[PDB]
Amino acid sequence: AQCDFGGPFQAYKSVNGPGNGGYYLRKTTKPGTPECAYVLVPQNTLSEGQSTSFTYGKLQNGQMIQLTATVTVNGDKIEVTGAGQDLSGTTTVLFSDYRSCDVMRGPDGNYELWVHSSAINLQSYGCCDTKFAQVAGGRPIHHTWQTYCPPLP
C-alpha cells in the first residue's frame, strides 16, 4: 500500500513512538557513528512543546552504556541539548509512522533511519526504507545497527 510522505510530522509523536522501548540508529549517511547507537523513548509521555530527559547510548565493551540528555519537541523539530558532539542540536522528522521507524535529517545535515527495537530484526522497514532511499539518494549509506548488537537496556 502507498506511503504518505505528506506531513506534517509531529516530533512529540515520533519521540514517544509506540509508547515503549527505544530506537536503534539503523542507517545513516554520516560516517563514523558509534556501532549500536540508540535512544530510549522518554520515561514519561511528551506533549507538544515540552522538554524532558531521555537515555541514549551505544555498544561499549559488550554492554549498552546509558547516558542522559534533554530533548525538546516543537512541530517537526527534535532539539537535543547535553548529548555531546553527536546527538546534540536539531533533528528534523522527515517521516515517521509513530510506531516502528523514523526518517530524520540529523543536526549535521545527514540523513538517518531509526528503527524501534520491536521492528529492528525485520527484513524490510517498509515505508521508512522507501523514504530513506529517496532522501539519501546516491550518498553513501552506513549501517550502524548489526544483528550482534545487544538488546536495548
Ligand X SMILES: NCCc1c[nH]c2ccc(O)cc12
Report in angstroms how near the CB of residue 25 gets to ligand X at its nearest.
7
Indicate the residue type of 13. Answer: K
CA-to-CA distance for 146 and 150, rounded, in angstroms?
A: 9
15 versus 59: smaller Cβ distance to ligand X: 15
Report in angstroms how near the CB of residue 69 gets to ligand X at its nearest.
8
Q: List interacting residues with ligand X (CB under 6 A).
A: 14-15, 17, 23, 39, 54, 71, 78, 80, 87, 91, 102, 104, 114
5 versus 98: smaller Cβ distance to ligand X: 98
Report in angstroms how near the CB of residue 47 gets to ligand X at its nearest.
14
Indicate the residue type of 87. Answer: L
Nearest to residue 30, comparing CAs of 114, 84, 108? 108
Nearest to residue 37, comparing CAs of 91, 117, 109, 103? 117
62 versus 68: smaller Cβ distance to ligand X: 68
Report in angstroms how near the CB of residue 116 gets to ligand X at its nearest.
7
